[PDB]
Symmetry: D3
Subunit: 320 residues, 6 copies
Amino acid sequence: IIPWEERPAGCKDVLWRSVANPIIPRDLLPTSNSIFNSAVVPFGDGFAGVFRCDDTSRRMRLHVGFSKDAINWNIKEEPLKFQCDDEEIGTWVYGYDPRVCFIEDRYYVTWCNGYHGPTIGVAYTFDFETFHQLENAFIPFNRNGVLFPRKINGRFAMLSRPSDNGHTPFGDIFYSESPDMEFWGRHRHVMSPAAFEVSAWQCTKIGAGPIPVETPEGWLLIYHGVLHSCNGYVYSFGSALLDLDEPWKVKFRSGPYLLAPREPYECMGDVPNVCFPCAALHDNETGRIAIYYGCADTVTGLAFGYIPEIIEFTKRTSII
Amino acid sequence: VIIPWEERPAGCKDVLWRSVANPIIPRDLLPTSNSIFNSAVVPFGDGFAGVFRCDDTSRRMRLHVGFSKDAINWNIKEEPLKFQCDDEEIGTWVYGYDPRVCFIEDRYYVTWCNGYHGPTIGVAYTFDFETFHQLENAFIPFNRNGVLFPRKINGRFAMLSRPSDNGHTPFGDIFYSESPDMEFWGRHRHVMSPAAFEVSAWQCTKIGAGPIPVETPEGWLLIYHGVLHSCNGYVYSFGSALLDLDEPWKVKFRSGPYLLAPREPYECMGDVPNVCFPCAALHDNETGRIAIYYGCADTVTGLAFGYIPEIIEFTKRTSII
Amino acid sequence: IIPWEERPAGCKDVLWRSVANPIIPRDLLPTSNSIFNSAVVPFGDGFAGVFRCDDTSRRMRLHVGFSKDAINWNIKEEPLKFQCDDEEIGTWVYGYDPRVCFIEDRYYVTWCNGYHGPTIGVAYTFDFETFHQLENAFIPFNRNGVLFPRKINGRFAMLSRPSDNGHTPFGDIFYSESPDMEFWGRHRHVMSPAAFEVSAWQCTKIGAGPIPVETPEGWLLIYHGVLHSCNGYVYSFGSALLDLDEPWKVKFRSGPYLLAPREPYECMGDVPNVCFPCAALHDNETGRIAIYYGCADTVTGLAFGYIPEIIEFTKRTSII
Amino acid sequence: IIPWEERPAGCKDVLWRSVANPIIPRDLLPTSNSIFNSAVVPFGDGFAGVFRCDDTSRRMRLHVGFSKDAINWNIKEEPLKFQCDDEEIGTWVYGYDPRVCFIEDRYYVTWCNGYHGPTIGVAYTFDFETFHQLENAFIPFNRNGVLFPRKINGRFAMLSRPSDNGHTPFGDIFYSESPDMEFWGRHRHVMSPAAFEVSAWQCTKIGAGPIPVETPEGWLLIYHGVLHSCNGYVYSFGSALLDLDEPWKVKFRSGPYLLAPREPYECMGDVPNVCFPCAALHDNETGRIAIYYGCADTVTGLAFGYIPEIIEFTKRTSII
Amino acid sequence: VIIPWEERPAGCKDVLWRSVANPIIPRDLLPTSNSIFNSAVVPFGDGFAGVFRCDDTSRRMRLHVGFSKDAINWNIKEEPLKFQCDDEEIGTWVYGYDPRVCFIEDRYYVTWCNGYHGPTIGVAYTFDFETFHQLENAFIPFNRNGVLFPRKINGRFAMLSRPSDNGHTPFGDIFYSESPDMEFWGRHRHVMSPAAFEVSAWQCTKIGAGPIPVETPEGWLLIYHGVLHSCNGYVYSFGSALLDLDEPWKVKFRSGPYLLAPREPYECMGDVPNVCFPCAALHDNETGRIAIYYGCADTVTGLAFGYIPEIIEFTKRTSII
Amino acid sequence: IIPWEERPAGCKDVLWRSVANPIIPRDLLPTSNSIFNSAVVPFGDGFAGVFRCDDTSRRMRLHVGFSKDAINWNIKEEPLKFQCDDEEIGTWVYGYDPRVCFIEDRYYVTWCNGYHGPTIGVAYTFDFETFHQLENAFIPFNRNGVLFPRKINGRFAMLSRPSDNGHTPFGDIFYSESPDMEFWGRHRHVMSPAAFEVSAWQCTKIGAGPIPVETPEGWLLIYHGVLHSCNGYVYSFGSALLDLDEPWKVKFRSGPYLLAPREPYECMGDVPNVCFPCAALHDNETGRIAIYYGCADTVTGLAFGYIPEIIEFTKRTSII
Ligand SMILES: CC(=O)N[C@@H]1[C@@H](O)[C@H](O)[C@@H](CO)O[C@@H]1O
Ligand SMILES: CC(=O)N[C@@H]1[C@@H](O)[C@H](O)[C@@H](CO)O[C@@H]1O
Ligand SMILES: CC(=O)N[C@@H]1[C@@H](O)[C@H](O)[C@@H](CO)O[C@@H]1O
Ligand SMILES: CC(=O)N[C@@H]1[C@@H](O)[C@H](O)[C@@H](CO)O[C@@H]1O
Ligand SMILES: CC(=O)N[C@@H]1[C@@H](O)[C@H](O)[C@@H](CO)O[C@@H]1O
Ligand SMILES: CC(=O)N[C@@H]1[C@@H](O)[C@H](O)[C@@H](CO)O[C@@H]1O
Ligand SMILES: [K+]
Ligand SMILES: [K+]
Ligand SMILES: [K+]
Ligand SMILES: [K+]
Ligand SMILES: [K+]
Ligand SMILES: [K+]
């Protein structure tokens, strides 16, 4: 049973913000400075997740949380530690940008893990108590690693986003596969930022957000895009539809955003003008989807909509 | 013509004061608008018309016509304005922003930052704010902040402009040019450069012309923006200068202080924080009233009021020339 | 008798903001745009200060102010002018970043003085009416000059911060001495920005804030640190303890910040996301300290704490 | 009778260097540092030109020169000074990049003229003794202004190259017309730099060189292209064919260059790795063309070819 | 195999010495070649073969096969090498540079910097140097300086690489990766970073693998390039390291001094001034002789010679680990 | 007796290169990569110097050398190590840019000393065998520190050049005084780069070269200037005359350079297009001066001229 608020009266938008935003405040932990990625999944008869909680030292750590209702979170004060046989991959430097999904028999966590710069860390859990760390999937510099929630033609699949070691001024989404969660390959380009004249909210760089959502015609991808203004980056998010069998083949890609920084909690904070989607919960029998997104790199917010309406919007407004 | 007006508050000593109704145009007036923050406004018939920059939810820059009975409450067309053009190449639409409008002699002219292998100044005319006829782009890229004078200067059309680059330009002088025919342009003259940081830092990075010049007996009143580069971005403020009536590239007085700078929440939070960008004015020489339209945070449109003679006085008193 | 508010009920922070913030508004003077450094000291029956008041031409000027309570200030409308026999040094270009302290027999004012670029200007006063300018202490480019409030083994001492001629993307704190307030030397490195992975609020650049506060466990240094986000700089502030006798030797340095931009008056304004500490009043008998800080380069705020608590926080959280 | 050297036996190149290169040395004048644009034309008995000669102050000045054979030049020691009735336009700041051609009844000179940054200066001369300055054709920033040698459908026509106020990192060629040599307009884009993967010698920026040469198949445009290596720009040059009646319409554009820096005089100098074409003399009866080019921004060189061979090369290798 | 060789010049105390015949390959060997400066060379039958980076007079980067009896005088094919691939997406040619070639078990493999939405490491194999069969690109962009080990390491193929950007990259660490199958890659391990400027400035900006690692009893001998960033550009020098045999990401010794730096006119002047870029080596374990191929000023190819044990001695003696 | 070559026949230049250049080659020492500052003085029976010799690790080290004739040098293989009781200042990181002169009773050496970035190191020797390190004169970032060869009104005096921590894109010359060779002050701006349109060889940055040369008319300062081309920096050098009593007051300053990179040893090497003057020897009786200068940051060269001729050239071509 997923978090839900009905479409506000008179609202014509395909996605609408929770009137209770933010749902997770910056100061939930005794030394939290900000809490703004919430990689959430159903777990048991409630919910679990891995949260980016930056502390008052501005260190980036991951913490486990649990919730009965997916809105009020009980986040562990101790940062998440990963078990690793290999001491060098198991060395912690930093971590941010978590994503979590269930694949076949267990939950997988990806995050941007420091190993001589940003790359994609990978781990699994059965219980959100012990996490077994796997090889980093890629060589740096890479982030916005997002696994598909089932195998594709008998291989694990992940979207990713080649980066640099700074505030990267570019970014294409890529797709890769693995037979074993250890060795990765068959890299395919998915998409590039759009031209400024076509769709400027996604003209500087783009990156995958929540775990891809399967629909009968393809994968619904919710992804961030950046616009470079004279005064900074503005992060908005939107939707695309990927081919089911070869998800690097993009079928439709929204011209308009789904959501952009509007509210004071999106516009003011540690990084102004940021809506960064990180997770979603959905129900295919009602079409309902709830999208979790970071707000100003400070707090966490929720937005709601219907999958069929998002799909119709993505096709009708498509730039491809 | 009855222009909008609010009297200055009790105890306010400022030369310009904001409308208590700001923002006068909201970001979501149209079903697909993301922001509406340039308002090129003129008297038209028994009321007012304008060309508005309305950026949509794809963050595309388009121009839309609007009409108003009082110049405060606007009815803006949902569909973007399309230009008619004799020439297919010039007529091709890439993007448009930064509109300005004025009447010269027998018709309304519209200039805008028109994409043609980069930003340049598009030119068109209209008799009715329904059909627009596009003329040659006035200049080669890169250029924007094109603003016509509202009459010919010694028998030639005249336009202020602002040589630019293809990004968020880190420099910018105002220039003046003439044309006998609205097709060929020349006699380019430098008007002014940014001020020295230690003299007037609100206008030390770059400058550009705003509203159409307003003719006064003490010269053309130019209201123009200026940029300060802080560690966290650009701050856009605006101020005033007086140009020679006959040779308007000769600046006679230029203000040290700004007239208006970002202060209010609607100016300090939005798509581009800390921007007050003036785009149009309405004025009444009988009363000396002036109403200046300005975009706020690249999100919404606001209005500010003052008196022409008080602005002239301020410009002279505080002149850095 | 220093300004004080009790720590809010339930508040676990070492420093807490005044509920009266901002204490100095942007428009206090007829031509002020912003008022955000407040170099304050006790004087006579109350308080005096040197204030950075940027005007509506965005020029950077210094003005003298007086207060009876150190909260409600009466600032002179006319900028401060300095007396100097040397016309070359005496030439005013611009001035910002003032700091003020009494040393032995008079008050000294330092500021970021334009002399072919930013350097540290120096002047004294006996009465806060007439100010007499001394030689600039250093060659450009330097700022964040902050004198010790007594001589150190017989010499005047000053912290500074080598810079460039723009929005400096680096910054270490240095220490220098002078026998005579004219010739300076014995330059020693104090500290550098921390590593991003250890303490990111202070990983781009740092600079000294208020006059050092003598304690039995060392000089308490309150200093700003910068984090470079994709959208610009975020200024926070924290604490270090310097050796009493050789103050370039850092004994303890906080990991977490003491204060970071949170309130709308800190997050929105001429320069968003800035808390810049400029002065402090303290009472060794009660342990109370009141720290003045510029907010968003627009207004002035106050924050309160106890010196023993700040000492304890600095030591327990030390990254060295 | 234009200069000529026959193609060496076995030489397969479309263009070949004079064996006498450099034809103008850097120290020809008592104060010359370098001499490296040579805007040459037939005049009377022999030849005349306008030369960029940078002095030992590294100032950029134009000088008039005369030659019997177009190879050995007698350049005037004193810079060229223009007569102008408008004192504002007639103010000399700097000048470089000259081009000279006869149109109708007199010689026109264009150059990169300082007027609050680079723009295209214009003047005329009947005798190469007195030069009369006209209005600058465009607003800054622009350079590489090159006139057509006759009117095009009753209007003067000029190629130009919108620029910035530095070492410009971009550059498209544009075309403009004027009824009167005063007011300019009908601006049209001619061509942009090529894609890196298609033709990298011309992928950063391009600019017109010699006066266009009229042929039955279009205007022969010889133009420079830049490649941005890790160690700077490399200037090469190539060929295109423009429509006769509407010269902004490009018919053919070479993939390969015609000439690139190879010789020590091209690869070592004030600006290493530069071949910058500035003029040509040609003879339609024989098809001979002689192209003048600056070498390393230090000296002037000559290269030879046949117009029909250049045309066949431009077509065969066309990237349009 | 008879590897090229010249004895050390009389009086010469350097560990490596340039051929007196340099450049051994000129820039205009082919009718349309602009420059020829990577030479990925191996023994083949009775002579030598290689894959050469020949940039053309359009300044396109292509790979060409060549053959030589002596490894000094090369017969390079006029037409660029084409790869067979049955996946059209991966088999699309955009550009290629930076080849390296070695024999592993049953065939020759060739890696190169292959354009696939930016630089990455392309991989192919050949049995005969006539037909080349392309495999998956080994990594996601941006990467280059991919260099295979000449045997499997504990049953897996192994490759050095170099994470990059899509420009003239201002950074660069060498990495190591493994693959069981020449298709999927993983077990990524950091090998080394640029040195500190105050320790060894020829290798302080970025580093990258050069020739195929050469196996010694004392480790893998890695010859690699290093960049120094002067006010006027990058200077590429090359030096030596020894890697653990079994875990080649563990560096045992790393030279402080360079082995070779741009000195000669053919190294200092050309398309990219001040570049010595090593691309291949031939060696003879019986004699200890090694011949190192290197690109000179991105224009021509040179040769340098030395003795493996003397290089090992120098690497240990001068080690900055 | 200082080295001398008479001006080549007909040569009209104020300064002329030695026909023996380069006088010091790059490979004098077993591990030298380049040898290109040579801070030279008369000593005992001949000459002594401190030389910048970068090694084959590209480390910057200073070495002592001696010569009978000041042309052919015997440079010590071992780098120079300074004696210093203070362990903090005595720590060696790197050193370059040496300058040497005799002041009153001993030889002083300054150099660009690494101390948390570049600053001016200072030391003395009586014998060119043992060198005794003093305090760094300034806080970083600074270089091109050049002492005057006597006291000025009872104080030691030094030119310097505020910098940054990279390849500095700016640079003015400053003057400072010290009563004791420990504490420094009375900082005065000497000169800034010229405007591009006035004198482009010196329009990016400038810095002092050889020790100032006393004349009856003022101090002859030989200094470098930088021009920023598209392909890098070009270092040339020229002359100014400073007031004898107040040497920050410039009396005349040359518009043209004295010398600029022309020869292959100046235009090809580790840093192309560099002539960097570092020391001079002179004879007041004859007016002869021999100027040592770094060539392409690879080798050392010599140029000769006459002090009165240099002075008249500086006056006649003065840009102030
Ligand atoms: C603590 C901090 O500033 N972290 C940021 C991270 O939030 C961001 O996503 C990345 C890219 O812009 O840069 C930094 O790693
Ligand atoms: C869509 C968008 O971000 N447009 C901006 C425009 O508003 C701005 O005026 C111009 C110059 O700074 O840059 C961009 O074109
Ligand atoms: C008027 C203005 O913008 N002044 C700022 C000043 O506040 C700031 O501290 C300094 C460094 O960032 O740069 C500028 O001088
Ligand atoms: C003196 C000097 O360096 N002049 C150059 C000029 O030669 C060049 O064409 C232009 C663009 O790169 O920049 C500068 O004006
Ligand atoms: C054609 C051309 O300039 N190619 C270069 C290539 O040689 C170089 O290795 C790379 C990194 O600097 O940049 C470009 O791809
Ligand atoms: C080894 C090396 O590259 N040193 C240079 C030095 O020669 C130069 O003067 C300084 C300023 O450009 O930068 C670097 O420190
Ligand atoms: K795709
Ligand atoms: K003017
Ligand atoms: K210290
Ligand atoms: K065209
Ligand atoms: K390692
Ligand atoms: K001076």
